[PDB]
Amino acid sequence: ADVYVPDEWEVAREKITMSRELGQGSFGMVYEGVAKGVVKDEPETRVAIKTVNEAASMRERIEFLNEASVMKEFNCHHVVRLLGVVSQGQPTLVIMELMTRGDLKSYLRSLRPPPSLSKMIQMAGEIADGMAYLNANKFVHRDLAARNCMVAEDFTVKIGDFGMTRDIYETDYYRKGGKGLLPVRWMSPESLKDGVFTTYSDVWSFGVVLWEIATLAEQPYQGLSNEQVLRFVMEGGLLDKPDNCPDMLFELMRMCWQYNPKMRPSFLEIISSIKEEM
Template sequence: LSINLFPQLKCIHRDLAARNVLVTKGRMAKIGDFGLARDIDNDTNYVVRGNVRLPVKWMAPESIFQGMYTMKSDVWAYGILLWEIFSLGVTPYPGMKVDHTFYAMIERGFKMECPYYANESVYNIMCKCWELDSCNRPSFSKLVSVMAAQLREIEEKVCTKIKIMVTLRNVQNKNIIILPSALPQHA
């Protein structure tokens, strides 16, 4: 299921996280666990509220403090999911216990640092997902278009670097000197 379909299906996932993303043989990511049973009793990432354990580190402030779940609280969780992906699966808010200090930091708008494998543009997307005021968070349709643009940009940069490497390898093999103006003009 695509995140872009959530609004059309009037679906609020409430537990969007890397642990609920399945990857097919064709490397397509699919969102799962729409209420599927699982053993969360021993998962320290869930906090007990009444008789329920909650994945607080993935939850938006309005979900934590007011028990409100909306499309925009799923957008917050999507930002956390991106952080998980670009940190290669590190648990969010590393080294932080879910306690009074954690809750106070979330209320003040604390944002995790940029994960090692994310560029500044992707980190900016994460930060927009983590806006305290849910009205200021992007919609899923906006996120899909922004992420698609990011992927195109990354693909262009990678293709340009490959062209440069192939050109340089050809030059080295033939002992030819090429002036910099003859190389592709991208990073």
């Protein structure tokens, strides 16, 4: 819209403190912190606070709240929970459940120096729970990667979005035609060719996340450039079975990377498929 209309999700600047720093978000810096009177039965609650650039335009501020207004509808334990908005005041804030172990790509890379089929299959099921929920509330994530999946103190996996502007995952984006950043290494053929983002194109990215878990977050298509990735995937090229990859997990990957998007499974079908095995 041209406007944002404050509602009861609003929470006073007073009750938000910020501790350390979490990363460069799209509209501003993101910080860890603490928040009061936002989950009653808890006096203080540990949160993540994303912020709007002091510089950044008003129509950019509207653009920022309206994306977090989408999260007010949501109620899935495998999607990072919205706790509040702080629109009235200078630094324009959104508060969120704090996922203590940060993003799934750092967690998998932290295990390099195997994990069990079981334990991998689990993560796959928890990611697919969130994603099934999202596709059902008519949300297409269009940047599902392990770096946007978030981990909890208990090692539970929740779907998130940390945007494209973190220095730490710069190799993971290509300014194609020199326009906006594109996570080309994760993108369906149809998303690469024609710019078509669907439930189905999320199921392609989910197959790359499976590949990330199996490899412990190796760079997909290592030793190809972004232009070479484009060509390879647009021509029906696929990823190699990771070394030591269980059969059951690589078969999900293939299913998810059908060229024809209507050949691929729904998240709902993926959840079914794993759930027979537990």
